[PDB]
Each structure stands twice: as C-alpha cells, then as structure tokens.
C-alpha cells in the first residue's frame, strides 16, 4: 500500500496544539485569523520549536502554508539524543505559499522548528501544518 497516516498539528491556530509545548527561543508568539505568528528579536536568530510531549514522528513529509519577511530555516530534532537536522531554507514571500518537504533525518523527531535564519527580526506566519508518514511526492491533502 501507498496510503499514509496524516497528522493534523494545527489548522487554524489560536493557541498551541493539544499535546505540544513551545521550546522556542528569541521570539514572541502570537495569533491572528488562524495563523501562528513568530516575532523574532534582531540578533537572536529566534525560532518557534514545537515539542511533541508524547511520542515521535519518523521520516515522511511536512506540509504547511507560510508567508515570511526573510529567509526561514526548517529543522527537526530528537530531544532524547539531542540531535538536530536541517530540512530546508525557504526564500522570502509576501503571500502565503504551500510547502511539502521530505524529512530525511535518520532518527525519530519530536521537535519541529521554524527559525529566523538571517537574525534580522523578520516575521513568520504559519497555517495548516500536517505530517504524513509518506513521501512529499505522494502527499494528497
């Protein structure tokens, strides 16, 4: 079979997802009209870090809508091993864009990070975050 398991982390955010903590640094988190808004401080390379309290994801792909004033680095991490893995760096956009990214990390992951890579304080807006156990090329919304 080709069928995946799709985990909806959040659709329209007005607060944190059930069963997640924020282990982020160097930013203020707020919400508007269903979007999670990251407001990083200049010089801190700030990020949101969504921490799954119980369990872990393995491989698969991450799907989300994002708009962003600057370049944004996407990472995943394993909190037990304390290892991190850089998935992609995404260019700036004034409009929301849908991304579907393969996660090639060789460990399970319980942290998903969206980071202000240039460290200039550029804001980030996220909607519609979903994990699939399958590949990005096989992802059906």
Ligand X SMILES: OC[C@H]1O[C@@H](O[C@H]2[C@H](O)[C@H](O)[C@H](O[C@H]3[C@H](O)[C@H](O)[C@H](O[C@H]4[C@H](O)[C@H](O)[C@H](O[C@H]5[C@H](O)[C@H](O)[C@H](O[C@H]6[C@H](O)[C@H](O)[C@H](O)O[C@@H]6CO)O[C@@H]5CO)O[C@@H]4CO)O[C@@H]3CO)O[C@@H]2CO)[C@@H](O)[C@@H](O)[C@@H]1O
In the list a second copy, ligand X, none, the entry touching 110 (Cβ below 5 to 8 angstroms by class) is: none
The span from the CA of 35 to the CA of 14, in Å, is: 7
Q: Which residue ranges make up the site for ligand X (CB under 6 A)?
A: 23, 25, 45, 47, 49, 73, 75, 77, 82, 84, 113, 115, 117-119
Sorted by sequence, the CB contacts under 8 Å of residue 85 that are 6+ apart come out as 75, 76, 77, 103, 104, 105, 107, 109
Eight-class DSSP state of 41: P
The only residue of 39, 78, 133, 135 in contact with a second copy, by rule CB under 8 A: 133
Instruction: Tell me the window of 16-24, 27-35, 65-73, 93-101 that interacts with a second copy (CB under 8 A).
Output: 16-24
∠ CA 33-101-119, rounded to 5°: 65
4 vs 29 by CB, closer to a second copy? 4
Smallest gap, in angstroms, from Cβ of residue 129 to a second copy?
13
Phi, psi (rounded to 5 degrees) for 34: 100, -5
3 binds a second copy (CB under 8 A): yes
Q: Is 15 in the site for a second copy (CB under 8 A)?
A: yes
């Amino acid at each position: 079979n080709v069928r995946a398991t799709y985990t909806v982390i959040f659709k329209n955010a007005s607060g944190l997802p059930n069963g997640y903590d924020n282990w982020g640094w160097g930013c203020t988190l707020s919400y508007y009209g269903g979007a999670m808004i990251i407001n990083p401080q200049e010089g801190k390379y700030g990020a949101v870090s969504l921490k799954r309290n119980s369990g872990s994801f393995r491989g698969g792909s991450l799907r989300f809508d994002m708009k962003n004033e600057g370049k944004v680095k996407i990472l995943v991490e394993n909190s037990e091993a304390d290892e991190k893995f850089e998935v992609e760096t995404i260019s700036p956009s004034d409009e929301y864009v849908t991304y579907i990214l393969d996660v090639d990390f060789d460990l399970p992951f319980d942290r998903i990070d969206f980071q202000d890579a240039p460290g200039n304080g550029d804001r980030i807006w996220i909607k519609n975050l979903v994990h699939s156990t399958g590949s990005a090329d096989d992802f059906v919304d």
